[PDB]
């Protein structure tokens, strides 16, 4: 029982049409309705900039030096900057076939437009910086649990 | 509206074949037997109408040439190109059973009935962009 | 060092990194231009 | 011996004569 | 797409028209030899570059040729995607 | 060869109609299309608040004291605030001849309207604060290059 025709190159395997997964994928900030592209950018930046600093925080060539925290902070700062650069220029050259390939039962949203992409990139920048600083604060006091010692 | 009995695959229609073009084929098969499809699959047809949707101008003509008339002798199949707007083209069949040589007078656009021994030349044909035909 | 100033300390990165960056960015947006104008 | 701000000088002779002269000799041929 | 080239040596066995899977040939009425109908290319735009056709041409120095051009497109390149 | 008539008070000198300059002026955030007035305000604030803190950072009457960084920060904060105040009241009294003098071949954008001006001022405020803090961070660790020592 395919989506619309059993001869199309798609299959109804219980991993791409399971109710659990479709609910879990629909409400993501990339698709959940009732929001603005601004908030989408904010949240995606928050998340990614909140996790994309560890992978080199204690892993960088300055791994065990007494500064590496702010080092990883600066690194992920530049990282999110250049990522915003990339997405912005993609928007700049964006509009051949101004769509996104749709497989979710509904269209995602009107988020699919140039200036929408630009605003999204701005919100991405803001949220990414924010996630960066907040992760740096969580990690700042190595004693964050030592004061609790629990 | 008849389509053969198949269990689904993973190589059917794509992001182009509904943004640029569609292909369809249909005939009359008064029997039901197992057949093979170029995207892979061994299935059964049904009596009379046999409608099938596809994306390439090669799977269709392969079915029409080798399967239908060379094995099943069926020869009443339309093959239809479709535009993005949903409108259709009727390229072939244009001669009934595609014999490709029989008619009482035929079309006439363009002719070159000349040998090769006197060929176009680089230094003689120059400062323009015509091809190997105009003498 | 010698009698020159800091310059050989930091004048490589911008030529090494940022000038290639703008080069390729401008180039890419150039290779997608509309018709019939282009800069 | 070696040199001084005079090297900032020899840098200054560039970026007007050779710089935009080459710029024009480039942009002549209609990008 | 690419360009097609016809000659006079078409005996008229018509093995090429039954070989091309791309519908780019037809035997238009001729008079010269016993053929009376010589092959030609009316629908070049669907040329593929397989050139299985002249391999089906038995004539000495096979009567058809294909000048393989440079103005290719999604049709001449043959993509399902 | 004037723009439309050789008798008009304009001249085709190769400084106001050079292809380089027109391309460089068209794509500025004041004119480049495909964006929202919001982003315009954001970017202009970013730029100006990013440079308008040095001119008094080490130049203020507290020039060489051990605090002058945050001093210049507060100064440029108040500065951008009062600038936003000014532009907002200008918008408040804006609509005699609700246009801007046009010399760029095209009209700039629909940015020319009261509420547009207000939103622009808001984005200006945000971006200005942002540029301020980010410049203060660049300048915070005097050792920003000393750790690199390159
Ligand atoms: C331990 C008791 C218990 C039991 C018997 C069930 C029973 C069920 N849950 Mg469930 N669930 C439970 C606790 C439980 N839930 C808890 C504590 C959570 C965390 C909130 C969930 C979160 C959850 C989700 C997110 C989903 C289920 C689903 C299901 C159904 C199918 C589960 C399956 O086959 O895999 C079934 C009615 C699925 C369902 O109903 O749709 C398929 C589904 O999508 N459950
Ligand atoms: C393909 C496997 C591989 C792996 C696992 C690593 C892993 C690592 N490299 Mg490395 N590297 C590789 C290939 C690899 N490299 C190659 C092919 C080159 C080119 C010669 C380099 C050149 C290189 C340099 C120059 C440096 C590293 C550094 C590092 C460390 C920093 C981790 C980091 O920033 O990740 C970030 C991960 C994510 C953001 C995700 C880490 C141990 C740095 C280091 O700590 O020194 C050893 C460093 O200075 N690497
Ligand atoms: C002196 C001139 C000047 C200055 C200071 C800035 C400053 C800035 N621009 Mg920028 N820009 C300029 C001219 C300038 N622009 C021109 C002429 C164009 C047209 C091509 C752009 C197009 C542009 C885009 C498309 C974006 C920026 C962005 C930015 C911000 C990111 C930081 C950065 O280095 O951007 C890089 C600056 C350049 C590559 C130039 C920053 C405030 C980004 C931003 O604010 O994110 C929302 C962004 O996405 N700029
Ligand atoms: C056009 C050919 C050419 C090439 C290939 C090089 C090559 C090089 N130059 Mg260079 N240079 C040139 C002409 C050239 N020079 C001229 C004409 C001048 C006079 C203005 C200079 C002044 C100059 C300085 C002041 C420095 C270099 C440096 C360098 C090295 C790093 C690249 C760099 O940042 O240069 C920059 C290129 C230009 C400014 C042009 C590299 C070996 C750097 C070096 O010695 O490495 C430590 C450096 O600091 N160059
Ligand atoms: C000796 C080195 C040399 C010289 C003198 C030239 C000279 C030229 N190139 Mg060129 N080119 C070179 C190396 C060189 N190239 C290399 C190494 C590559 C990469 C393989 C290219 C790739 C290239 C492309 C892709 C194009 C040119 C073009 C041109 C012409 C116009 C350039 C222009 O608009 O300026 C631009 C300069 C600046 C903006 C600075 C000009 C005759 C253009 C041309 O002839 O179009 C008809 C063009 O489209 N060049
Ligand atoms: C006379 C006024 C004045 C003063 C004192 C400064 C002071 C400074 N500017 Mg600045 N600037 C000014 C006017 C001024 N600016 C004007 C009018 C413009 C034109 C828009 C700029 C454009 C500008 C740019 C584009 C950049 C700077 C940067 C810098 C810093 C120098 C770093 C240094 O040597 O260590 C500390 C020195 C001092 C505290 C002195 C410093 C805070 C740079 C920066 O922010 O670093 C990335 C930088 O890239 N400035
Ligand atoms: C020539 C231009 C250039 C420059 C200036 C840099 C500069 C830098 N790279 Mg880098 N890199 C470059 C080209 C360059 N890279 C290329 C071409 C590659 C391979 C494709 C890499 C691969 C690379 C890796 C894998 C890593 C770096 C890292 C670094 C940083 C380490 C600090 C340092 O070098 O000393 C300046 C600082 C002090 C002396 C103190 C620094 C910002 C490391 C880093 O910290 O990244 C987060 C790192 O892990 N680079
Ligand atoms: C979604 C998203 C994203 C993404 C983004 C995008 C998608 C972008 C991308 C983009 C990109 C990533 C791009 C890139 C590009 C590349 C390039 C642009 C290249 C370069 C080139 C070159 C280098 C050139 C060459 C040349 C030429 C062409 C001519 C002659 C000269 C030369 C040879 C030089 C992110 C991650 C942010 C995040 C999440 C979300
Ligand atoms: C388990 C699991 C998983 C994972 C997940 C995770 C683990 C997640 C995470 C979680 C979390 C938990 C995270 C997140 C968080 C975040 C945060 C928390 C952030 C925050 C930030 C912010 C919000 C910021 C803000 C700001 C800004 C933006 C600007 C200014 C400043 C401020 C600060 C205000 C998966 C998927 C695989 C699935 C399976 C299971
Ligand atoms: C004002 C001033 C200053 C500044 C200055 C500067 C920073 C300079 C710059 C410099 C520069 C800015 C330089 C550049 C150089 C140039 C050159 C070296 C060029 C050449 C080019 C060429 C040779 C090219 C060629 C070509 C090609 C490659 C392709 C095709 C086209 C052509 C052929 C054209 C200072 C502070 C010191 C002092 C005080 C005052
Ligand atoms: C664009 C822009 C801008 C600008 C803005 C504006 C445009 C503004 C304006 C504003 C204004 C320009 C204002 C002014 C005002 C003034 C005043 C208002 C004065 C005062 C007066 C008086 C003092 C009075 C007198 C009197 C009377 C009348 C009566 C009796 C009493 C008395 C004697 C008191 C900015 C830079 C921000 C930024 C960038 C962009
Ligand atoms: S080209 Fe070959 S197949 Fe075609 S008519 Fe001539 S002899 Fe027959
Ligand atoms: S490649 Fe040969 S057989 Fe195929 S369409 Fe072209 S001429 Fe006909």
Structure notes:
The PDB classes it as photosynthesis. The entry lists the keywords Photosystem I, photosynthesis, cyanobacterium Chroococcidiopsis sp. TS-821. The structure of Photosystem I tetramer from Chroococcidiopsis TS-821, a thermophilic, unicellular, non-heterocyst-forming cyanobacterium. The structure is cut from a larger assembly and holds 2 copies of chain A (150 residues), 1 copy of chain B (135 residues), 1 copy of chain C (39 residues), 1 copy of chain D (31 residues) and 1 copy of chain E (81 residues). With 39 residues, chain C is mainly alpha-helical. Chain C has 1 helix and no strands. Chain E is mostly beta strands and 81 residues long. Chain E has one domain. Helix content of chain E is 5%, strand content 17%. A two-stranded antiparallel sheet of chain E has the order 1-4. Chain E has a two-stranded antiparallel ribbon with strand order 2-3. The two termini of chain E are 19 Å apart. Chains in contact: A-B, A-C, A-F, B-E, C-D, C-F. Chains B and E meet through helix 1 of B and strand 2 and strand 3 of E. The complex binds chlorophyll A (CLA) (7 copies), beta-carotene (4 copies) and iron/sulfur cluster (SF4) (2 copies).
The helicity of chain D comes to 55-70%
Largest interface: B-E, 30 and 28 residues
**Overall body shape of chain D:** rod-shaped
Report the sheet-strand fraction of chain D: under 5%
Number of DSSP E strands of chain B: 6
Instruction: Classify the secondary structure makeup of chain B into a structural class.
Output: alpha+beta
The total of helices of chain D stands at 2
From the N-terminal CA to the C-terminal CA of chain D, the straight-line distance is 46 Å
Q: In which order are the strands of the major sheet of chain B placed?
A: 4-1-5-6
Share of residues in helices of chain B: 10-25%
């Amino acid at each position: 029982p395919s989506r619309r025709d059993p001869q199309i190159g798609n299959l109804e395997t219980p991993i791409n049409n399971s109710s659990l997964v479709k609910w879990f994928i629909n409400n993501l900030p990339a698709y959940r309705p009732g929001i603005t592209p601004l908030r989408r950018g904010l949240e995606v930046g928050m998340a990614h900039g909140y996790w994309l600093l560890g992978p080199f925080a204690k892993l960088g060539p300055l791994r065990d030096t007494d500064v590496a925290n702010i080092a990883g902070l600066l690194a992920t700062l530049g990282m999110v900057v250049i990522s915003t650069l990339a997405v912005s220029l993609y928007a700049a050259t964006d509009p051949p076939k101004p769509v996104a390939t749709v497989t979710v039962p509904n269209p995602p949203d009107t988020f699919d437009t140039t200036e929408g992409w630009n605003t999204f990139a701005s919100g991405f920048l803001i949220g990414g910086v924010g996630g960066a600083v907040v992760a740096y604060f969580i990690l700042a006091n190595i004693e964050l649990i030592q004061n609790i010692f629990k | 509206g008849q389509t053969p009995i198949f269990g689904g695959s993973t190589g059917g229609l794509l992001t182009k074949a509904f943004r640029e073009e569609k292909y369809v084929i249909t005939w009359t098969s008064p029997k039901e037997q197992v057949f093979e499809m170029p995207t892979g699959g061994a299935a059964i047809m049904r009596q009379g109408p046999n409608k099938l949707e596809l994306a390439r101008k090669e799977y269709c003509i392969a079915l029409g040439g080798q399967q239908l008339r060379a094995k099943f002798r069926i020869t009443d199949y339309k093959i239809y190109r479709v535009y993005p707007n949903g409108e259709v083209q009727y390229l072939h069949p244009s001669d009934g059973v595609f014999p490709e040589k029989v008619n009482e007078g035929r079309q006439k656009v363009g002719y070159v009935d000349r040998n090769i021994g006197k060929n176009p030349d680089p230094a003689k044909l120059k400062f323009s962009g015509m091809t190997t035909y105009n003498a | 060092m010698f009698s020159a100033s800091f310059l050989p300390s930091i004048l490589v990165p911008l030529t090494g990194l940022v000038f290639p960056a703008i080069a390729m960015a401008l180039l890419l947006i150039y290779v997608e231009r509309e018709d019939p104008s282009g800069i | 011996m070696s040199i001084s701000d005079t090297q900032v000088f020899v840098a200054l002779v560039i970026a007007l004569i050779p710089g935009v002269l080459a710029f024009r000799l480039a942009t002549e041929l209609y990008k | 797409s690419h360009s097609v080239k016809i000659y006079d040596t078409c005996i008229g066995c018509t093995q090429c028209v039954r070989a091309c899977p791309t519908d780019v040939l037809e035997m238009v009425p001729w008079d010269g030899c016993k053929a009376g109908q010589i092959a030609a290319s009316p629908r070049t735009e669907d040329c593929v570059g397989c050139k299985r056709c002249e391999t089906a041409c038995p004539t000495d120095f096979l009567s058809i040729r294909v000048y393989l051009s440079n103005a290719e497109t999604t049709r001449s390149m043959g993509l399902a995607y």
